Amino acid sequence: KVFERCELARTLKRLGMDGYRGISLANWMCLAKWESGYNTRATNYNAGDRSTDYGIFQINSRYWCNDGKTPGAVNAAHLSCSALLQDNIADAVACAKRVVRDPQGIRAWVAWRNRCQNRDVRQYVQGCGV
């Protein structure tokens, strides 16, 4: 599914993402935006290391979900990567919460640092009623 901006914001709010481990909703919105364009079906194969990024948050198969074909992976979230491609984002949100429980927090995604860190991200939630 391709989410509309405010529809996603409200969904994230309801799933408890606002302020999770100190990360505002706007930050999560910024992240989904640059990672997938708010698309749950997005997949990106990394030829470099043979891992794949899955779903709306582009979560990597070497550490957080199992896809079976990734060399030397772990499944920290203990989830099939297939779960990150559903229309329903409950699993993907549970997974993103696990990722940020590590010391790097949101810094885990380089896209976040490139496109969202030290920026005015209010834009992503303006007018959504969150």
Curated annotation (Swiss-Prot):
GO CC, alphabetical: azurophil granule lumen; extracellular exosome; extracellular region; extracellular space; specific granule lumen; tertiary granule lumen
Record GO terms (molecular function): identical protein binding; lysozyme activity
EC code: 3.2.1.17
Domain C-type lysozyme: 1-130
Protein name stated in the entry: Lysozyme C
Catalytic reaction(s) noted: Hydrolysis of (1->4)-beta-linkages between N-acetylmuramic acid and N-acetyl-D-glucosamine residues in a peptidoglycan and between N-acetyl-D-glucosamine residues in chitodextrins
Keyword terms of this UniProt record: Amyloid, Amyloidosis, Antimicrobial, Bacteriolytic enzyme, Disease variant, Disulfide bond, Glycosidase, Hydrolase, Secreted, Signal
Coiled coil (UniProt feature): none
Disease link: Amyloidosis, hereditary systemic 5: A form of hereditary systemic amyloidosis, a disorder characterized by amyloid deposition in multiple tissues resulting in a wide clinical spectrum. AMYLD5 primarily affects the viscera, and the predominant clinical features are renal dysfunction of varying severity, and intra-abdominal bleeding. Inheritance is autosomal dominant.
Subcellular location, principal: secreted
Something else known: Lysozyme C is capable of both hydrolysis and transglycosylation; it also shows a slight esterase activity. It acts rapidly on both peptide-substituted and unsubstituted peptidoglycan, and slowly on chitin oligosaccharides.
InterPro entries attached to this UniProt entry: Glyco_hydro_22, Glyco_hydro_22_CS, Glyco_hydro_22_lys, Lysozyme-like_dom_sf
Positions of disulphide bridges: C6-C128, C30-C116, C65-C81, A77-C95
Keyword Repressor among UniProt keywords: no
Organism encoding this protein: Homo sapiens
Functional description taken from the UniProt entry: Lysozymes have primarily a bacteriolytic function; those in tissues and body fluids are associated with the monocyte-macrophage system and enhance the activity of immunoagents.
Family of the protein in this entry: Belongs to the glycosyl hydrolase 22 family.
GO biological process: antimicrobial humoral response; defense response to bacterium; defense response to Gram-negative bacterium; defense response to Gram-positive bacterium; inflammatory response; killing of cells of another organism
Active site: E35, D53
SUBUNIT field: Monomer.
PANTHER family, alphabetized: LYSOZYME C (PTHR11407:SF28)
Tagged with keyword Signal: yes
Catalytic class of the enzyme: hydrolase
Entries under Pfam families matching the protein: Lys
